[PDB]
Amino acid sequence: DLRLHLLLNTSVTCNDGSPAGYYLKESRGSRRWLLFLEGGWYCFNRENCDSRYDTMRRLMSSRDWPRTRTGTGILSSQPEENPYWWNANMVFIPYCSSDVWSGASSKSEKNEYAFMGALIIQEVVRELLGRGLSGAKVLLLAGSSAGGTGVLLNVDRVAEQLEKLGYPAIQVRGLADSGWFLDNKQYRPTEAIRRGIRYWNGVVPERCRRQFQEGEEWNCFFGYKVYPTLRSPVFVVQWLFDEAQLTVDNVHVQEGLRLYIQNLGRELRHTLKDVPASFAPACLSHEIIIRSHWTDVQVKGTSLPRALHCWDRSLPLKGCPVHLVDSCPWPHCNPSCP
Ligand SMILES: *[C@@H]1O[C@H](CO)[C@@H](O)[C@H](O)[C@H]1NC(C)=O
Numbered sequence: 132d133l134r135l136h137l138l139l140n141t142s143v144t145c146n147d148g149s150p151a152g153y154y155l156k157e158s159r160g161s162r163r164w165l166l167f168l169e170g171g172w173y174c175f176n177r178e179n180c181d182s183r184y185d186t187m188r189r190l191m192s193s194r195d196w197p198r199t200r201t202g203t204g205i206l207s208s209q210p211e212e213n214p215y216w217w218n219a220n221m222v223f224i225p226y227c228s229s230d231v232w233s234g235a236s237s238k239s240e241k242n243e244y245a246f247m248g249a250l251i252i253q254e255v256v257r258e259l260l261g262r263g264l265s266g267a268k269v270l271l272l273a274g275s276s277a278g279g280t281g282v283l284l285n286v287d288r289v290a291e292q293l294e295k296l297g298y299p300a301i302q303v304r305g306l307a308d309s310g311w312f313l314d315n316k317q318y319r320p321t322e323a324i325r326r327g328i329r330y331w332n333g334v335v336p337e338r339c340r341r342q343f344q345e346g347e348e349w350n351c352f353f354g355y356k357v358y359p360t361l362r363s364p365v366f367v368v369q370w371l372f373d374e375a376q377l378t379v380d381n382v383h384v385q386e387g388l389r390l391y392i393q394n395l396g397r398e399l400r401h402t403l404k405d406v407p408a409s410f411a412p413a414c415l416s417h418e419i420i421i422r423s424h425w426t427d428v429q430v431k432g433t434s435l436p437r438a439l440h441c442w443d444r445s446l447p448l449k450g451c452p453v454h455l456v457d458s459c460p461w462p463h464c465n466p467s468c469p
Pocket residue numbers: 140142143250
């Protein structure tokens with residue numbers, strides 16, 4: 132069980148002005164810290180944010196949050212469920228800003244909602260330093276779906292924040308699960324992000340911002356575009372036939388669709404060729420790292436917990452690989468798929 136703490140700085144808020152927070156379970160005999168970012172789509176104007184507030188309110192407010200949360204997958208403390216980091220300090224950061232963890236805008240007279248995803252991460256880190264994070268050796272910033280993209284947008288800023296606070300010794304790294312998307316042609320969305328960024332006053336990494344410049348920062352929400360600008364080590368997990376990707380592509384089997392799906396897999400694999408730390412099975416699914424049975428999937432005989440342990444050691448190893456991308460071209464040609 133992870134225990135809830137609302138932010139002491141009550142000016143850092145969820146969408147409706149309620150305080151943000153984090154769930155925490157300490158492990159005093161460990162110097163490893165895992166901060167995990169929840170996912171759950173987003174909203175990009177007044178009308179569809181109002182809709183989200185009726186039926187997805189826990190993603191917009193902390194007023195109904197429970198006081199505890201059970202750790203699962205990589206957030207589990209039992210070695211049988213989490214062979215990778217079962218003894219680490221666990222943090223679950225709920226997604227209540229609807230901004231893909233990019234916003235830095237307060238609720239005001241001109242703003243019905245607050246979008247403070249980028250500032251929530253910074254404040255969580257800042258308050259955790261007083262509860263044990265000051266002595267860490269590694270801070271792994273992880274996340275799934277919208278949280279995965281949020282890892283890519285924020286990992287370097289967390290490194291920069293800790294350097295400027297006087298903690299150069301803490302090693303900051305990223306783990307992006309199911310947040311690596313392609314701006315491909317649909318079978319039958321870039322505007323939504325561009326409109327959202329203006330709505331949220333969203334921010335992107337600076338390298339990436341200086342490459343693409345004004346009006347074009349939506350490009351930095353796409354993994355294959357923002358990854359080469361990052362300096363912190365980042366491990367990328369992505370299903371080759373992601374359900375969220377296919378949904379936006381309006382895919383729900385004849386030649387046309389066969390060639391479409393086969394081409395999606397080949398392009399995704401291409402974008403990962405120069406990503407040295409990656410795990411990409413040929414499956415139709417979405418998210419993995421906090422699922423309880425995340426130990427079952429394997430690429431070329433290597434599980435995801437093993438690949439992550441090999442990454443720890445790397446920071447070329449005999450029989451302990453870090454780059455694992457399937458080569459077969461159809462969903463669930465890998466027998467270990469969910
Ligand atoms: C609380 O957070 C806000 C937004 O980041 C910041 O302006 C303010 O200075 C913070 N308060 C304290 C006491 O640090």
